Amino acid sequence: SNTQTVLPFTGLNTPSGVAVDSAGTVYVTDHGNNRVVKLAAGSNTQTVLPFTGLNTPHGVAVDSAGTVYVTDHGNNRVVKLAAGSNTQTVLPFTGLNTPSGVAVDSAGTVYVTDHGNNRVVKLAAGSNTQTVLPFTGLNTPHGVAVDSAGTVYVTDHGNNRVVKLAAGSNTQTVLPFTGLNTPSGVAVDSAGTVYVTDHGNNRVVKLAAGSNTQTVLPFTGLNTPHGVAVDSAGTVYVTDHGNNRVVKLAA
């Protein structure tokens, strides 16, 4: 599409993460206001999720049941809220330092970019002890995403690259993105297309599987975009952080 839509969130300040569930509900981390807000598809009014004690929250993810996972970055913790629940759960990660991105796979495993420790950790559903993914040489990583085979994608923000790690592998792969001037958000769709937000170039780029064709999505007027999400219809959502808005663009 060459039509982008500003979602009717209101009063955002320096928003970071965005996520979209199978029903089309959109969640955004309104980082500068210490809140997480959501818009149901077609809804006119945003609602603040009843998280408690959030401080400069960053990443957000949502699973198939509508559970919302948020990196409570200012508190070095990750919290989740089941749909309809008023009582958040603090996930039992340990030793986090300014965590950023969060993702959740089909098995309910939660992946967190432990940005301040240059590592990515994961926590299986029902487990109380995280594992460290064997990425190497990361520097201030930001976003994280996971596909259906369990392959994990991380934006290695400080090294201006996007790297991926298959489940059970020791060798990470640098993806053939070009001209990145520091990446932030990442997402992956069912076709294996990888989407990245490019901070210094104020743009969202996607990488087609196999061909490795890179295309700049025709968003316009972006200013320091942060989070990116993609829904089942292929529509791309970006947190336009510098402009305090969330924008979407159909394929």
Side-chain angles (χ1 to χ4, degrees):
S1 177
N2 275 263
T3 303
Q4 70 182 17
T5 299
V6 180
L7 295 189
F9 293 111
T10 66
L12 306 180
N13 181 260
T14 56
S16 284
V18 60
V20 51
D21 69 18
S22 64
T25 299
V26 181
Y27 310 79
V28 56
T29 307
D30 191 14
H31 152 277
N33 291 317
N34 290 343
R35 69 189 175 165
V36 176
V37 289
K38 75 162 165 186
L39 268 177
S43 185
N44 294 335
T45 166
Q46 81 186 7
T47 65
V48 178
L49 286 184
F51 287 110
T52 291
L54 294 183
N55 194 327
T56 56
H58 271 229
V60 61
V62 62
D63 68 17
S64 39
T67 302
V68 182
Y69 305 78
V70 173
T71 307
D72 191 15
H73 151 279
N75 290 321
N76 291 339
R77 69 179 181 171
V78 181
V79 298
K80 68 173 180 197
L81 200 51
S85 179
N86 272 0
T87 306
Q88 74 194 15
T89 299
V90 179
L91 291 179
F93 292 101
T94 166
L96 302 182
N97 179 325
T98 55
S100 280
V102 58
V104 59
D105 69 16
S106 65
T109 298
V110 179
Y111 305 74
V112 176
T113 304
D114 188 15
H115 150 273
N117 294 318
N118 294 327
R119 68 183 182 165
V120 181
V121 297
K122 83 164 151 176
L123 189 66
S127 177
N128 292 318
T129 309
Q130 72 200 20
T131 62
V132 183
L133 283 62
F135 292 104
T136 53
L138 302 187
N139 191 281
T140 62
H142 277 212
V144 61
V146 184
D147 67 19
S148 70
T151 292
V152 179
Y153 306 75
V154 56
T155 64
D156 190 12
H157 155 285
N159 292 318
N160 198 27
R161 71 193 178 158
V162 182
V163 317
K164 77 172 186 174
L165 244 197
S169 177
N170 234 9
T171 292
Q172 69 192 10
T173 296
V174 183
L175 278 56
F177 284 104
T178 52
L180 293 185
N181 278 90
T182 309
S184 277
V186 66
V188 61
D189 68 15
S190 49
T193 302
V194 177
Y195 305 78
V196 176
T197 71
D198 185 351
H199 166 94
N201 288 312
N202 299 298
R203 72 187 182 170
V204 182
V205 172
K206 67 176 182 191
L207 179 66
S211 67
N212 287 323
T213 300
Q214 154 165 331
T215 67
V216 184
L217 297 187
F219 290 106
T220 188
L222 299 181
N223 183 20
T224 68
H226 268 220
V228 62
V230 61
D231 69 14
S232 57
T235 296
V236 176
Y237 304 69
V238 62
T239 298
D240 191 8
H241 154 276
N243 291 327
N244 292 329
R245 66 184 185 163
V246 184
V247 187
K248 67 172 178 183
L249 184 74

